[PDB]
Amino acid sequence: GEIAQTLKEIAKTLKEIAYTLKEIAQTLKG
Amino acid sequence: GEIAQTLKEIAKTLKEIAYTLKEIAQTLKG
Amino acid sequence: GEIAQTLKEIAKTLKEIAYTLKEIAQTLKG
Amino acid sequence: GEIAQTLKEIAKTLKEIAYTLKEIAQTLKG
Amino acid sequence: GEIAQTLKEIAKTLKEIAYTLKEIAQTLKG
Numbered sequence: 001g002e003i004a005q006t007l008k009e010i011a012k013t014l015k016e017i018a019y020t021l022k023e024i025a026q027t028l029k030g
Numbered sequence: 031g032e033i034a035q036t037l038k039e040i041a042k043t044l045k046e047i048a049y050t051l052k053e054i055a056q057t058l059k060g
Numbered sequence: 061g062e063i064a065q066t067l068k069e070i071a072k073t074l075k076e077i078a079y080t081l082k083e084i085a086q087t088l089k090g
Numbered sequence: 091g092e093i094a095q096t097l098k099e100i101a102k103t104l105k106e107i108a109y110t111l112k113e114i115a116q117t118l119k120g
Numbered sequence: 121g122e123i124a125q126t127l128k129e130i131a132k133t134l135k136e137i138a139y140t141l142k143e144i145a146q147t148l149k150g
Contacts, residue, residue, distance in 0.1 A: 006037040007126040013044040014133040020051040021140040027058045028147045036067040043074040050081040057088045066097040073104040080111040087118045096127040103134040110141040117148045 002034050003037060004122050004126065006034065006041055007123060007130065009041045010037065010044060011126055011130050011133065013041065013048055014130060014137065016048050017044065017051060018133055018136045018140065020048065020055055021137060021144065024051065024055050024058060025140055025144050025147065027055065028144060033064055033067060036064070036071055039071050040067070040074060043071065043078055046078050047074065047081060050078065050085055054081070054085050054088060057085065062094050063097060066094065066101055070097065070101050070104060073101065073108050076108050077104065077111060080108065080115050083115050084111065084118060087115065092124055093127065096124070096131055099131045100127070100134060103131065103138050106138050107134065107141060110138065110145050114141070114145050114148060117145065
């Protein structure tokens with residue numbers, strides 16, 4: 001269904017956000 | 031329906047957040 | 061019901077997060 | 091009420107995220 | 121089912137995001 005597919009898209013985007021924030025956190029530690 | 035459309039709006043805002051985070055990560059590396 | 065209203069609240073909080081990240085991105089660029 | 095409880099948890103975590111980002115934005119000003 | 125499981129995964133990823141943002145905030149506050 002459309003709702004289940006949209007939720008899978010949201011989950012995938014959140015995993016990208018989680019990854020980018022870990023990159024940022026490491027950059028801030030030098 | 032309203033719930034499906036609200037989820038699509040959530041997905042779109044998350045893509046904007048993910049792109050701004052990539053811009054921040056790039057700014058921190060110069 | 062409560063599910064539709066909570067989704068609307070989530071969408072609003074994400075718009076706030078998106079705008080605070082734009083503020084952060086701008087401050088880091090000076 | 092499992093769906094409603096999970097959405098309320100997501101909403102609560104997003105409020106925490108929004109406040110931590112406002113704290114970050116304040117620190118970087120600064 | 122699938123929708124309930126996807127929402128639980130979204131909740132878990134948001135908790136990870138919230139933790140990494142607390143680490144970022146602490147690094148920037150020294």
